[PDB]
Design a binder for this molecule. Sequence first.
Ligand SMILES: NC(=O)c1cccc(Nc2nc(OCC3CCCCC3)c3nc[nH]c3n2)c1
Length: 260
Amino acid sequence: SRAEDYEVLYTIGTGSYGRCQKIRRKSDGKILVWKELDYGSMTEAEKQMLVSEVNLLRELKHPNIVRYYDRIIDRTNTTLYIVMEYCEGGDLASVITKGTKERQYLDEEFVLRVMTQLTLALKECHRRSDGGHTVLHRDLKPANVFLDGKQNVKLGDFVGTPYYMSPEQMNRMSYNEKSDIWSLGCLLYELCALMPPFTAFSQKELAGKIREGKFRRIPYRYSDELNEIITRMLNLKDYHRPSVEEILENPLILEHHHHH
Ligand SMILES: NC(=O)c1cccc(Nc2nc(OCC3CCCCC3)c3nc[nH]c3n2)c1
């Protein structure tokens, strides 16, 4: 319940909410991380918005979602620490960087595992098994997708250019479930091609490309069937994109893709 219960091992890096550090739980020596949120400048009603959200995501449980463990209020540091699963395998953006550096495309089997596991994770968000509020991820990109020691997917972290920006967002429409699907399409495309489907120097040039809805086929290394399902996620019309249930129905997706 206190910072004292954990020993900071070292600092990993700093992201959206704030800084992230690798830690040891004193009780048993378990390696974890925590995410720091400074609430020092927040009002009480700004805070109220935060406490509901934290609680909702905390009930979220799935083998392909980064596991929540604990929360800590530190008055002295005016910081809220969220303790979560440490993911030994790093993130997917690093996997993609590595492919580019090595000039080696990822195996189709690896892409199908990532598609399968992210879609399972999203399904638990979009359809709580039993049984609470629907959750949209809202920030789905390679840097938010972590990996364990066997490279199973762990979906986490619920001036740059927004490569993955959906047609909805761009048209002043509300982010919905199919907006998560558009982002998954962008991520899987990038996993295959080692580049995002729409690239640009400026945001207005990017918006232009995204509105036109056109992109290269993923590499011929990959089956027509994989190309098809990713291309379907990148449909301009949200109602033409598949639901998580429709993705999982695909003939490509087999039992061994659910876990390495
Ligand atoms: N990106 C890394 O340096 C790295 C390398 C090896 C393992 C990890 N593990 C890791 N990493 C995380 O995020 C660090 C990342 C995201 C926030 C901004 C800084 C970098 C995790 N969040 C929940 N669980 C997490 N596990 C990470």
